[PDB]
Ligand binder design. Structure first.
Ligand SMILES: NC(=O)c1ccc[n+]([C@@H]2O[C@H](COP(=O)([O-])OP(=O)(O)OC[C@H]3O[C@@H](n4cnc5c(N)ncnc54)[C@H](O)[C@@H]3O)[C@@H](O)[C@H]2O)c1
Ligand SMILES: NC(=O)c1ccc[n+]([C@@H]2O[C@H](COP(=O)([O-])OP(=O)(O)OC[C@H]3O[C@@H](n4cnc5c(N)ncnc54)[C@H](O)[C@@H]3O)[C@@H](O)[C@H]2O)c1
Ligand SMILES: CC(=O)N[C@H]1[C@@H](OP(=O)(O)OP(=O)(O)OC[C@H]2O[C@@H](n3ccc(=O)[nH]c3=O)[C@H](O)[C@@H]2O)O[C@H](CO)[C@H](O)[C@@H]1O
Ligand SMILES: CC(=O)N[C@H]1[C@@H](OP(=O)(O)OP(=O)(O)OC[C@H]2O[C@@H](n3ccc(=O)[nH]c3=O)[C@H](O)[C@@H]2O)O[C@H](CO)[C@H](O)[C@@H]1O
Lengths: 336, 334
């Protein structure tokens, strides 16, 4: 069970609130859209259809009641534009900010647009929220912030130098958030994600995350590439864990705010083991080439998640193996 | 001696310099020096906190031939196309364009962010793609933040205390990342409260020295935010010009590095009001309020790094600096 979460969701259903999800047509955003509409919350959504999709919002329509859906007001717009950020914050209680351009390679290839999206856009949204005097503010940080720090597991206090323009932007999100707490008393929570996966994560496009990437390759019967030696390790975290933690953070005690928390499970899968898992779970649904290391890459990733467990009563319920089983059906229906 | 050695070689084989923030306090002082060295100079400013009249002044201090190898473009660092075009044929970049003032950034962090981050990145990236010989940018002693140790060593850094402080720390991190992923080595200069000729005395954001000088001349109130025991390493302008040039022409091993630019002296605000007063009286010529929010408490540089790797010689200290600066202010404000 996820008791605290269970309690807070109950709390929400009785006294519903108005939420803003930026990046709401994206992977994590539309997943938050699902849960929040299933709790009868009023939700304002903001996306620009950069990496996000209309079909993800169309999917959530089929997944919820028409009554629940009529409380969703979606706005097409850009976080890089301040006035739209201000317009979108009117009467908002809780801010879940997921809008950004991900991908470490994307940021090497084009650090300028990545900067405007992930720094300027984050600040537009943060400032607008402080000005609107929202009840809470939660934003997507990253495990990439750990940079070249060698120790495992990864604790929130200890980071190294950033290895990618992507990492810089996300780290900058944290600095700004902390500084907003210092100067305005606006307390936020930053969630450092550790490779999230699950339903609605884009398998198409040159910048696809590894799990939906390999899944599409394996299904079609194409080559599956391993960047380096495959001993590179990750703490893959199924979406529902991220969903739990965003909501936990939005209704967190005040003393629990102005904090950074790892969002993961505490596990360590190498890229070799992962291929094996994505092979097995696709077999039971009835249907390898090594190259050089990706540049600006983090080597090993494993979260120490006890801070979230401690302060927020986070209870991670879904490990990678169970996560893949729940996700593979969705990907088959998607690429058929 | 190394600085004087360098400046001579510059006279003999002049290089092309890009100065961003050329119409501002530090930038215009760099202009005057470079033009006195017969350097080809390209200047970029948007006249935000800068001034056409600062250029006019430099024009009067330098011959008309030296003034003809100055190409000024009015424009904004926030626009990448202008950052790209201004890099044409450039040898050395001195990046000085930014919006200072901690209080400015508390009222309006979005605007401070756009210029100090977006604009900085714009100019970093263009120089990287232009393949210039060097890139040196203005960093800040503010990025020491809440770190209590004295003196201030480049390595030992605390939490930033303001939006302005963030932007200037971000400049360092991006510079580090560009060295990492693109092999483009830069130098960041942590300036420590610079003063001298052309530091704007007007407006709500004026630094202590020009502001206090202005008010003492006008008989207005002189305000000390808090203790008066709040302390700084006031750096005379000619020391900064020296570092900028030493950094522009560093050997490869001295690049991808950060340097404190200061003198190594600690001066309290109480002491400063006395010093400025002393120096104004010699040219034939106080209320306590609350601490300024997001202020750094004590600031004093250890400048041993710059001395070792860049052969820096901190020449002018507070007193001689004020004596050199005071006549400029009287003539200007009159
Ligand atoms: N996916 C991971 O494993 C992971 C890990 C760490 C951090 N994050 C962060 O989580 C957040 C969501 O990632 P995701 O996996 O859902 O990726 P995604 O690309 O599916 O979601 C991003 C969404 O933000 C929207 N967006 C981007 N720029 C925008 C703009 N300027 N204006 C309006 N909307 C904009 C996109 O259209 C998209 O809908 C991002 O901040 C990402 O950097 C993700
Ligand atoms: N003076 C100090 O005490 C001190 C200390 C540490 C760091 N710095 C930094 O040193 C640099 C020089 O500043 P200064 O002290 O000469 O102040 P200043 O205000 O006189 O100079 C700033 C110049 O940059 C220009 N500018 C601002 N935004 C611009 C933009 N977007 N596009 C083009 N031009 C723009 C302004 O018009 C002005 O000419 C800045 O980076 C400042 O933040 C100053
Ligand atoms: C540990 C870390 O910093 N994680 C962050 C990083 O994800 P990652 O870059 O870790 O996620 P990813 O799925 O892009 O890469 C995972 C690993 O798989 C490798 N790979 C990928 C595809 C392929 O076809 N073959 C292959 O070998 C890739 O080189 C990497 O080592 O950035 C993401 C944003 O996009 C998130 O912010 C993550 O938190
Ligand atoms: C130590 C530090 O972080 N220094 C940085 C910070 O300068 P500072 O903000 O320290 O420079 P400043 O000239 O604004 O003020 C210095 C001191 O003077 C005090 N004061 C000022 C005006 C007044 O009327 N009365 C009064 O008491 C002010 O509160 C502060 O304690 O930002 C500058 C650019 O903006 C530079 O980047 C400096 O490197």
């Amino acid at each position: 069970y996820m008791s605290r979460y269970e309690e807070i969701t109950q709390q929400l259903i009785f006294s519903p609130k108005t939420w803003l999800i930026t990046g709401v047509a994206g992977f994590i955003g539309s997943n938050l859209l699902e849960k929040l509409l299933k709790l009868n919350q009023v939700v304002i959504g903001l996306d620009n259809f950069s990496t996000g999709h209309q079909y993800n919002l169309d999917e959530v329509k089929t997944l919820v009641s028409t009554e629940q859906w009529s409380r969703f007001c979606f706005i097409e717009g850009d976080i890089r534009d301040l006035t739209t950020c201000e317009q979108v914050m009117k009467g908002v209680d809780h801010v879940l900010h997921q809008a950004a351009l991900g991908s470490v390679p994307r940021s090497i290839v084009d650090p300028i647009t990545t900067n405007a999206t992930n720094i300027t856009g984050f600040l537009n949204i943060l400032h607008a929220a402080k000005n609107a005097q929202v009840q809470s503010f939660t934003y997507a940080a990253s495990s990439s912030t750990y940079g070249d720090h060698p120790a495992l597991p990864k604790v929130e206090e200890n980071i190294g130098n950033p290895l990618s323009p992507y990492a810089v932007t996300k780290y900058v999100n944290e600095i700004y958030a902390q500084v907003y707490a210092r100067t305005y008393g606006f307390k936020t929570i930053g969630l450092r994600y550790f490779n999230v996966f699950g339903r609605r994560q884009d398998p198409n496009g040159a910048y696809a995350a590894v799990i939906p990437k390999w899944t599409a390759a394996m299904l079609k019967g194409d080559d599956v590439y391993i960047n380096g030696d495959g001993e590179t390790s990750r703490d893959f975290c199924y979406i529902d864990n991220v969903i739990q933690m965003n909501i936990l953070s939005a209704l967190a005690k005040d003393s629990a705010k102005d904090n950074i928390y790892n969002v993961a499970v505490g596990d360590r899968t190498t890229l070799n083991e992962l291929s094996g898992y994505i092979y097995d779970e696709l077999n039971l649904i009835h249907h390898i080439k090594y190259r050089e290391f990706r540049s600006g890459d983090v080597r090993h990733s494993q979260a120490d998640v006890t801070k979230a467990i401690d302060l927020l009563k986070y209870r991670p319920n879904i490990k990678i193996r169970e996560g893949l089983r729940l996700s593979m059906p969705w990907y088959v229906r998607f690429l058929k």
